[PDB]
Structure 1
């Protein structure tokens, strides 16, 4: 389902993918890559099946795509009703049913009343029965979060304001940690070990958010839907703690047991969540929390420290071409606009963990061209932003 990568022959080892038969859409997506346009005369797809498996293989061969659905009480319809009401585009319930008469459900061929009742009973919307957005209802639509999740997000942030720990970045990370989902398979023993070795200030954040020690890779070590979601959020917030501490990905993998792809996926998800939480607090008139969260989206997107938050504005300074360029004295995009060209070439030549330097979207770049583009990007950034 990703990038366009055609191959002359596509061999699909087994029709059973992950314990379940291969999806017909997935199978079509795979076999559509068989054959390079303008190079090959034909393209070949070979699905390797056997014995009984032969039946599922022939079903995939002769199958066709399933019809499209709507997926619309439900979270999607709640989101849609909130989106229209809070935007001011629809006010009366007659308009509310008119809107549902414009959806895919109306084209495929009660719920809106239930959605309006749920939004009214949860203080997302006020009734005068003209429906008007509240402050929480406006903040949910602004920070782009599901109204189902926004209730617990509001409760968590409101509890965090009452007591906050400013001597580390872990409390500002537990709030921007999205969830556990399935980003990794948490090892309980490993978690408990890390916990037994946290600073004298972390466990303060751990107990201020809900984590424990009697249930913190303990009971589950030798073997509750919210406490599981807290510890699996604490561990997740510990990993991000090492991501914003510029710990190398291999060290994070060794200490936590999660591979680098999972760590990168988690950091991207956490940066998205941090941006959403920042907007949510900004629209709610929470100035003492939005100010704290305003930098963690960048610090999680690039996995950096605060010092590099100005250097990573350059498109070619991710988290290691900016740290080696920061240690040499360049700590600001201003010092990098006139940064001696050949100098940054030498600095990028040093510290190796022709076009060896790889840039996202630029593929491989030679050291000289890489740092030349770095200084040019710094010049553009500081020149067009004022």
Structure 2
């Protein structure tokens, strides 16, 4: 019984599991699976440590549900990168058996329509939109089971409220059908204290385990000594070589042990400085003053669109690297990818790596309990350390939080502390969309039945203004009042389809309708101004730098700014010598200026020297602004503005890839991001139709040139050789031509 072979799974999936090394099934997962009536369809929510293999139970459940009853399934994952990684893993797992998978990661959308799809692995922001679309045309029968991850974020978070709304909509739908269950919900979480309340809200039984494949022991240092969590001295520290912080010694213990070490840093500048220090201290500690494959990783970064960074030069050919938010989205995967293989030994990361892809390491070191001027949160601290200890390789994993003076008292509190219990975050802006998602889909019409929906949410299960909040929608024309029975309006139905927050729509509707008065078409700026999402905190603005850029703007672009509220007289003028809606317009204009250079295919390095914002915040904005163009276009489609939908139709593809209008068709191949299509375009190939018929040997030479054996890189499959990738360029083009016709 304690073997995967005894459990029922297709053969191909099983041999795929041997390919990944997972040959022993833990007792906790099997016991939780046999526990209760989970198999026959009743929902479940469970918790486990991150390194224990939380995904195994979800994968077995989705397999069994798909094979038992023919019904499509979902995969809700927090971030885009983890979503793409899980998409590729699931695809490699599911190729042979027949359950095709394809993902909805923000900007990117499937070529095939959903009813053909089976497992739609997707982020929350578009999982909610897909659920709304399915609930729209009474087509919820295809859904058979839904996977959610990290249930702890539905509380105080920017996007978890979408997850809670989607879950409560599913619960409301299945409880309406009772007038065993239509749709399964499975989930994984951290060591949540109130997970029973969460489990009871979805009438699921609770199973909580703390079992770990390898032991984990935290440690806190006091000067030149190491203290355990429970006021215990487990080891006496003694630095070997160094030239109270004694940073190199802790990593130096790992190097002589032949194991990897993860050393995260508070802020952006700390990662570069710390990475150089360890690389600098490797000059004399190992030279008295895998190389071949390490140079290949360095060779990978040489002709990346952003090139190879200066600080990355002095560290990479020594086993030391660093990885933060400011790096390019392509160098982030290379550094992470080779870390899995073990080429790099030291990483200087920020807190963003905590929530990303699994990065196993034997020793994890945290710089300060203070992260960015604020104390470290307990929730991210559990997954801060959870990566320590490789499965089946390392028998002991440890974490060494570094504290000084009086900060030790604050630091030790995290070791004995527990992550805060979840909330519901539900006037409230996250509840306005909650009732708009149900009364516009037509499932709930009578007000009394709507009151039962508020009895099905997380707020109700935890243990007035709900009825006072539909009046807020009544004021803003979102709903028409009839005999009470509520019916959606043109604005109400357009917001739901495009999946925008009703708070933002009121401004957009009055902003998009102000393009009726006057529009410019010589330059893409005004079109881009209506697709720039917001400012958030994507970068720090440079006003004097904006002044020099403001003057040098040609005549055509300056016409746009005056038309949207930006003032030539006041722009980088009063801020130097010293309005919230006015302030959010000027940043909106700067966001549109940056995006226009992105869609002009200007070098990413050149934008840094000109725009002051580095490549890390650029792709974190063009990916976020590409989703916005995909929501404005749908918003204008349902609102009956056929002319505006025409202009913004092509701007989702342009912002995602930073391409021009010419390369829109070439880029449809997944292996041509932004430069593999430009150099290919100059080779006389202007469309994907005739690129599919290209000579295989012809594309090899053209791809060799334009340089700013597995040395060429493609997202999702790590590195590749030039001969194979060039063959993949044509091979992908073969499959596109007949699959869409």
Q: TM-score range by the shorter chain?
A: over 0.9
Larger relative contact order, structure 1 or 2 (CA cutoff 8 Å, min sep 6) = 2
TM-superposed CA distance for 1:162, in Å, is: 2.1
CA distance in 2 between partners of 1:66 and 1:226 (Å) = 35
CA distance in 1 between partners of 2:527 and 2:717 (Å) = 33
* 1:122 has 2:457 as partner: no
CA contact (8 A) 1:268 1:301 kept: yes
CA contact (8 A) 1:96 1:112 kept: no
TM-superposed CA distance for 1:269, in Å, is: 0.8
Name the SS of the counterpart of 2:629 in structure 1: helix
Aligned residue pair count:
386
Give the corresponding residue for 2:593: 238
CA distance in 2 between partners of 1:254 and 1:383 (Å) = 44
Please, which runs of 5 or more residues in structure 1 have no aligned partner? none
Name the SS of the counterpart of 2:667 in structure 1: coil
CA contact (8 A) 1:161 1:289 kept: no
CA distance in 1 between partners of 2:620 and 2:516 (Å) = 28
TM-superposed CA distance for 1:221, in Å, is: 2.6
Alignment deviations for residues 182-234 of structure 1 (CA, whole Å, 9 cap, x no partner): 11101001111111011110011111111112221111133311121111011
TM-superposed CA distance for 1:110, in Å, is: 2.2
CA contact (8 A) 1:8 1:34 kept: yes
Name the larger-Rg structure.
2
Name the SS of the counterpart of 2:365 in structure 1: strand
CA distance in 1 between partners of 2:675 and 2:469 (Å) = 48
Give the corresponding residue for 1:334: 689
CA contact (8 A) 1:9 1:34 kept: yes
Name the SS of the counterpart of 1:102 in structure 2: coil
Name the SS of the counterpart of 1:331 in structure 2: coil
RMSD of aligned residue pairs (Cα, Å) = 0.8
Alignment deviations for residues 63-116 of structure 1 (CA, whole Å, 9 cap, x no partner): 111101101111111001111110011112111110000000011002211221
TM-score, L = length of structure 1: 0.99
CA distance in 1 between partners of 2:571 and 2:392 (Å) = 58
CA distance in 1 between partners of 2:422 and 2:654 (Å) = 39
TM-superposed CA distance for 1:180, in Å, is: 0.8
Give the corresponding residue for 1:220: 575
Alignment deviations for residues 10-64 of structure 1 (CA, whole Å, 9 cap, x no partner): 0011111111111111111110011111110110111011221111121011011
CA distance in 1 between partners of 2:680 and 2:698 (Å) = 10
CA distance in 2 between partners of 1:213 and 1:202 (Å) = 12
Query: 4+ residue runs of structure 1 moved beyond 4 angstroms?
Result: none
CA distance in 2 between partners of 1:84 and 1:238 (Å) = 38
CA distance in 1 between partners of 2:607 and 2:578 (Å) = 25
Name the SS of the counterpart of 2:539 in structure 1: coil
TM-superposed CA distance for 1:171, in Å, is: 0.7
CA contact (8 A) 1:246 1:303 kept: yes
Name the SS of the counterpart of 1:10 in structure 2: strand
TM-superposed CA distance for 1:305, in Å, is: 0.2
TM-superposed CA distance for 1:332, in Å, is: 0.5
Name the SS of the counterpart of 1:212 in structure 2: coil
CA distance in 1 between partners of 2:538 and 2:694 (Å) = 40
CA distance in 2 between partners of 1:229 and 1:216 (Å) = 13
> Is the deviation greater in 314-323 or in 332-341?
332-341
TM-superposed CA distance for 1:179, in Å, is: 0.7
Name the SS of the counterpart of 1:312 in structure 2: helix
TM-superposed CA distance for 1:364, in Å, is: 0.7
Please, which runs of 5 or more residues in structure 2 have no aligned partner? 1-354
CA contact (8 A) 1:311 1:317 kept: yes
TM-superposed CA distance for 1:161, in Å, is: 2.1
Alignment deviations for residues 152-180 of structure 1 (CA, whole Å, 9 cap, x no partner): 00000000122100111001100000011
> Is the deviation greater in 217-226 or in 5-14?
217-226
* 1:344 has 2:725 as partner: no
Give the corresponding residue for 1:189: 544
CA distance in 2 between partners of 1:122 and 1:262 (Å) = 35
